[PDB]
From a paper:
In order to understand the substrate recognition mechanism, the crystal structures of LpSOGP in complexes with G1P, Sop2 (with isofagomine d-tartrate (IFG) and (NH4)2SO4), and Sop3 (with (NH4)2SO4) were determined at 2.1, 2.0 and 2.2 Å resolution, respectively. The Sop3 (with (NH4)2SO4)-soaked structure shows clear electron density for the Sop2 moiety at subsites +1 and +2. The Glc moiety at subsite +2 is a β-anomer unlike in the case of Sop2 soaking, though two ligands at subsites +1 and +2 are well superimposed, suggesting that Sop3 is bound at subsites +1 to +3. However, since weak electron density was observed beyond the 1-OH group of the glucose moiety at subsite +2, Sop3 appears to be mostly disordered at subsite +3. The disorder at subsite +3 is perhaps due to fewer hydrogen bond interactions than at subsites +1 and +2. These observations are consistent with the similar kinetic parameters for Sop2–5. The electron density of glycerol was observed at subsite −1. The glycerol molecule is well superimposed with a part of IFG at subsite −1. The SO42− ion was not observed in the catalytic pocket perhaps due to precipitation of ligands in the soaking solution.
In this study, we identified the function of LpSOGP, determined its crystal structure, which is the first one among phosphorylases acting on β-linked glucan, and clarified the binding modes of substrates. In addition, LpSOGP did not show phosphorolytic activity toward cellobiose or laminaribiose. These results indicate that LpSOGP is highly specific to SopNs, as LiSOGP is, and is completely different from other GH94 enzymes in substrate specificity. The tertiary structure consists of four domains: two N-terminal β-sandwich domains (residues 1–257, yellow, Ndom1; and 295–553, light blue, Ndom2), a catalytic (α/α)6 barrel domain (593–1020, green), and a β sheet domain (magenta). Ndom1 is unique to LpSOGP, being missing in CBP, ChBP, and CBAP.
Residue numbers in the entry: 1 to 1113
Write the structure that this text describes.
């Protein structure tokens, strides 16, 4: 059985423009040359995101009617470049004429006839303004770089947008406005038009009032324009228009293309314009959102609640003793980002896994998106989640339920409960509760949907599945076979998946009495439009399930007879416990809140980190699949080193070293770690150090110098194929270090910036910057890394170890000689020669608004590179110029923004949106600040810093922080600034907490792993070494009397902290009152902790596993 692909049947063409529509006239793909103008493709059930709304004002009501798309009930005529919608709203007759002209200009001509006292129109248009691949890859990201400029033309507001992130080499542009009627108000983001309330009501919030007339630069690029209100008695006519320019290299300064628009306006197609058949929804109602639960209901279903978050006495969220996090409906309506979750199947934690099964879900009834087996991009069954507000609500697995006459799509539940093993949705129905559960099987490549009516009441359902079977929906045909209640799905030949995973298939077990169709069953006349929407109609049932299996290599297994959530929950609980070494903080009296939060969060962060590693994708950042080179060296390796998963790390390192590129002998920016030969051979300048650092850390932690003699291949730059000319990892290392020697600016050991450093938004804007910039952070990391490498290699190759020492000394010397002035480490040096040198991100750069950088300041402490006095200074700089209530910032002022053109840094100066790194509080870098504080023993700052970025009860800790999902990592914290200009002007609000701040992209980050390492290794102070344990806590008096349960070398022990500032020594460890012998650790900033031998430590733990740690902070 072959499922055909959706093709938009309405195809408008003119010149270099192809605009396609679904049968009801919903935007599908609007292409001008190589630029996609819309942000979202319409789908056959919801239609598209754009519309034109007629509003009617009366004495006792406001009404609002969409005029286009499947939801208008318009009849439709088409020609080759023209679309004509016709219908009535109340007693107003309308016609809307869409004209696609030859000039990369389009019109919506509106004509209204009838009698009414007061009406207006709202124009609504989602805009991508990138290549097709850019749009599909990540709409949110693309929108962040689309800068809007607002002008008054002859007919009120006109919206001009420039895409600042290069598309090919082009910077595309849009203009939108009105003709023959004044646009009296405008908005530029989806959150302004639809609002958060949409996620419940399914009605765009702006429809009830006036547009705000503010440009909000956020992630839903969405233009709206509101006409002046008018009377009708007879006929009135007017237009909206758009203009696309594929390349607008200048910044936007005024309204352009006035004469071209006037010309285009006069354009009409000669041909006939003929009726087309419009399929119409049959017995499909509006979506169904649950009613909200009251306190009695919450109490009944969740009698045991922890860490309750309340606002205005409404319960928003809480955690449970079962390690779940529960979200109530009201919270979702306040959070800009949608609550969500990623399921992932367990794997053998001694090896880099393959074929891991993953699924994503969200609270507003996206039960299962991006079902994948192995590769998260290509080995996929269900389409990705897109957007933020669930306008387009088709993705992945969706559920309709019949209520009265009508099937209604489930959206927002009363409550949403996440566990590491699954998600559960509770919908309140009339005198019933429907429980939906989507969950991972333990030891099996499966996700399971279960639906249960609590009162055993029977309902009718349609479960839809937007199939991919391949990377994307609507690309390729799909093989579908059925045997009884088992479907098997596999990719057809053209699909890339087919080439590298030829045996890949999915299977679905469906309910015994169900009927199978495509979208045909939704329409009055049974017309298939989207043949790859797999629909399962299930009649008069009080429960059912659908079980989804994935087989990347075709190892098909039979379905179990019963699929039990509770058993998986228990198994995943133990799996995660073991992953974190049975981490548990306890105390006899009330545990401190900080410890209570750590116990709550640590397995969530473990889960996040484990996804980042094994099934790499995020919520917003859905497109991943690859390992990032620096990424895998940080979150995953640091997590695994911290918890003793040394075999896994060894394997990760061998896999990583195999991906070093032949010839250049650096690493790609990122690479697939499966059979897809795909990588990005161009890299940032910092990337070469990470694998060097990580291997040194592994060697130091395990003593496993054998990893250096392993024979490991390389990859070719263009093809990403094995070179089949392996060498020892030692020789890999040598070749990588040669590249580093070649980075020296002549006459120095200053490392050239090259492709950039850690901050992916600070890529050099030209080749002079690439050659003559020096990042002080990079310099520091290079020193750190070469010293670590020196030590790891000292026993194996004396001569190379000696050379590494020299190099490190030279780099160190250059760092102190060039990059420090007046006690301040410069962010950057620009050096043409000894005679022409200048600082950036240093107080000496008086022309600049930017005078301090965080990164060099932390790294130089972490590396023990900064002498005690310099380090001390670094901290004072942070305190005075970088520290904010939401954490430490990356620089003391934003990067330049002047309409989107880059002068020094690329994406930092192009981002229209205040978010991500541009927010200047990127959490990962804050976590490094924590590491530096721990290095210095500054326990009160370190623990306060730890809590500032902890999502559990964040709003109580950081009063200007806006609430966000509490059981997932947030990557950034950004001021609620609508544009870069306001951001620059009122930046100081961030220091004082006089602006609100909101959370960034979730889950996918090295942050969760490196946070874990901060908690356990740096602060609680339990670290593993070659047949030794290091105890070096940096704790506050608040942890006095608190105990950590932790499994060490396979033995569970209990570390009880005693914080005694009156002791004559720094640290003392006891078991059964016997003092444990050991050596003191090296630390230039403070007294170090203690190194105890493994044999000694274990011998003590066998007789008494309660270790008492006496420390003086
Ligand atoms: O997706 C937007 C973000 O991309 C980050 O770089 C990603 C990296 O996180 C990922 O591990 C690899 C492999 O999928 O792809 C890179 O493009 C940048 O650091 C961010 O600035 C950007 O927001
Ligand atoms: Ca105490």
């Amino acid at each position: 059985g072959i499922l055909k692909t959706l093709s938009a049947p309405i195809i408008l063409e003119n010149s270099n423009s192809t605009f396609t529509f679904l049968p009801g006239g919903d935007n599908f793909e609007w292409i001008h040359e190589s630029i996609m103008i819309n942000a979202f493709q319409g789908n056959t059930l919801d239609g598209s995101t754009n519309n034109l709304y007629l509003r009617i004002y009366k004495d006792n009501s406001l009404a609002f009617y969409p005029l286009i798309g499947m939801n208008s009930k318009s009849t439709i005529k088409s020609g080759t470049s023209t679309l004509i919608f016709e219908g009535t709203a109340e007693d107003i007759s309308y016609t809307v004429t869409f004209r696609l002209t030859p000039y990369g200009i389009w019109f919506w001509d509106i004509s209204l006839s009838g009698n009414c006292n007061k009406a207006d129109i709202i124009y609504s248009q989602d805009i991508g303004v990138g290549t097709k691949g850019s749009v599909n890859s990540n709409e949110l990201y693309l929108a962040q770089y689309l800068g809007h400029s607002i002008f008054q033309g002859d007919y009120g507001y006109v919206i001009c947008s420039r895409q600042n992130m290069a598309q090919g080499d082009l910077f595309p542009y849009l203009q939108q406005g009105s003709l023959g009627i004044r646009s009296i108000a405008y908005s530029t983001d989806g959150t302004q038009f639809f609002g958060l309330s949409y996620k419940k009501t399914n009605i765009p919030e702006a429809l009830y009032g006036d547009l705000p007339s503010k440009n909000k630069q956020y992630e839903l690029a969405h233009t709206a324009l509101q006409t002046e209100a008018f009377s009708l008695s007879g006929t009135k006519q007017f237009s909206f228009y758009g203009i696309c320019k594929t390349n607008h290299p200048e910044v936007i300064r005024e309204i352009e293309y006035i004469q071209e628009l006037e010309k285009a306006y006069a354009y009409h197609e000669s041909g006939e314009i003929l009726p087309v058949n419009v399929p119409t929804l049959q017995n499909i109602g509006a979506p169904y959102a649950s009613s909200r639960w009251d306190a009695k209901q919450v109490e009944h279903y969740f009698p045991k609640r922890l860490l309750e978050e309340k606002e205005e006495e409404a319960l928003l969220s809480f955690f449970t003793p079962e390690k779940s996090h529960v979200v109530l409906q009201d919270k979702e309506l306040t959070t800009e980002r949608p609550h969500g979750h990623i399921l992932m199947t367990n794997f053998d934690v001694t090896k880099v896994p393959q074929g891991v099964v993953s699924s994503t879900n969200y609270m507003y009834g996206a039960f299962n998106c991006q079902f994948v087996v192995g590769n998260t991009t290509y080995n996929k069954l269900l389409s990705n989640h897109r957007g933020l507000l669930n306008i387009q609500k088709d993705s992945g697995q969706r559920i309709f339920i019949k209520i009265g006459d009508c099937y209604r799509q489930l959206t927002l539940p009363a409550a949403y409960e996440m566990n590491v093993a699954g998600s559960t949705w509770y919908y309140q129905l009339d005198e019933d509760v429907l429980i939906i559960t989507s969950f991972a099987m333990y030891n099996r490549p499966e996700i399971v949907l279960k639906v249960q009516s609590l009162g055993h009441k029977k309902y009718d359902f349609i479960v839809t599945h937007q199939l991919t079977v391949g990377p994307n929906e609507y690309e390729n045909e799909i093989k579908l076979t059925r045997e009884g209640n088992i479907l098997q799905l596999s990719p057809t030949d053209p699909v890339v998946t087919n080439h590298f995973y030829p045996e890949l298939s999915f299977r679905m077990r469906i309910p015994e009495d169900c009927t199978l169709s495509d979208d045909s069953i939704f329409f009055h006349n049974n017309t298939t439009i989207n043949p790859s929407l797999l629909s399962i109609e299930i009649l008069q049932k009080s429960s059912f399930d659908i079980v989804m299996q994935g087989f990347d290599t075709g190892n098909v297994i039979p379905f179990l007879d019963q699929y039990d959530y509770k058993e998986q929950l228990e198994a995943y609980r133990i799996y995660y416990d073991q992953l974190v070494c049975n981490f548990k903080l306890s105390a006899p009296d009330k545990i401190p809140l900080s410890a209570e939060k750590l116990n709550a969060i640590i397995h969530w962060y473990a889960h996040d980190a484990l996804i980042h590693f094994a099934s790499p994708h995020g919520l917003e950042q859905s497109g991943g699949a690859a390992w990032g080179t620096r990424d895998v060296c940080q979150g995953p390796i640091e997590f695994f080193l911290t918890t003793g998963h040394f075999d896994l790390v060894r394997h990760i390192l061998i896999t990583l070293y195999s991906h070093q590129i032949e010839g250049g002998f650096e690493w790609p920016q990122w690479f697939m770690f499966d059979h897809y030969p795909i990588h990005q051979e161009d890299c940032h300048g910092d990337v070469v150090f990470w694998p060097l650092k990580a291997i040194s850390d592994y060697i130091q932690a395990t003593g496993d110098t054998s990893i250096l003699n392993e024979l490991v291949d390389y990859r070719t730059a263009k093809d990403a194929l094995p070179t089949n000319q392996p060498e020892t990892i030692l020789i890999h290392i040598k070749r990588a270090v040669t590249t580093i020697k070649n980075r020296y600016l002549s006459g120095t050991a200053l490392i050239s910036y090259a492709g950039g450093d850690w901050d992916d938004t600070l890529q050099p804007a030209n080749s002079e910057l690439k050659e003559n910039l020096v990042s002080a952070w990079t310099q520091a990391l290079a020193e750190q890394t070469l010293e670590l490498l020196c030590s790891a290699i000292k026993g194996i190759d004396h001569d190379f170890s000696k050379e590494l020492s020299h190099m490190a000394n030279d780099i160190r010397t250059s760092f102190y000689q060039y990059l420090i002035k007046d006690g301040v480490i410069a962010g950057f040096l620009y050096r043409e020669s000894e005679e022409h040198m200048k600082y950036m991100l240093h107080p000496d750069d008086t022309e600049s608004s930017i005078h301090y950088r965080l990164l060099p300041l932390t790294r130089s402490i972490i590396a023990q590179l900064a002498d005690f006095k310099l380090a001390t200074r670094n901290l004072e700089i942070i305190d005075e110029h970088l520290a904010c209530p939401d954490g430490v910032r990356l620089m003391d002022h934003p990067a330049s923004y002047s309409g989107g053109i880059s002068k020094i840094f690329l994406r930092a100066e192009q981002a229209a949106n205040v978010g991500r790194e541009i927010s200047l509080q990127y959490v990962h870098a804050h976590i490094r600040y924590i590491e530096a504080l721990a290095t210095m023993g500054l326990s009160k700052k370190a623990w306060d810093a730890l809590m500032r970025i902890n999502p559990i009860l964040l709003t109580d800790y950081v009063p200007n922080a806006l609430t966000r999902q509490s059981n997932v990592y947030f990557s950034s914290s950004e001021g609620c600034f609508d544009d870069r200009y306001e951001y620059a002007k009122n930046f100081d609000k961030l220091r004082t907490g006089d602006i609100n701040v909101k959370g960034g992209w979730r889950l996918y980050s090295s942050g969760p792993g490196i946070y874990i390492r901060r908690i356990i290794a740096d602060l609680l102070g339990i670290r593993f070494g070659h047949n030794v344990i290091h105890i070096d806590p940096v704790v506050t008096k608040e942890l006095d009397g608190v105990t950590l349960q932790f499994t060490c070398f396979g033995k569970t022990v209990f570390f009880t902290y005693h914080v005694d500032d009156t002791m004559d020594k720094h640290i003392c460890v006891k078991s059964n009152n016997n003092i444990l012998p050991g050596d003191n650790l090296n630390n230039i900033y403070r007294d170090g902790g203690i190194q105890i031998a493994k044999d000694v430590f274990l011998s003590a733990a066998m007789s008494d596993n309660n270790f008492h740690i006496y420390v003086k902070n």
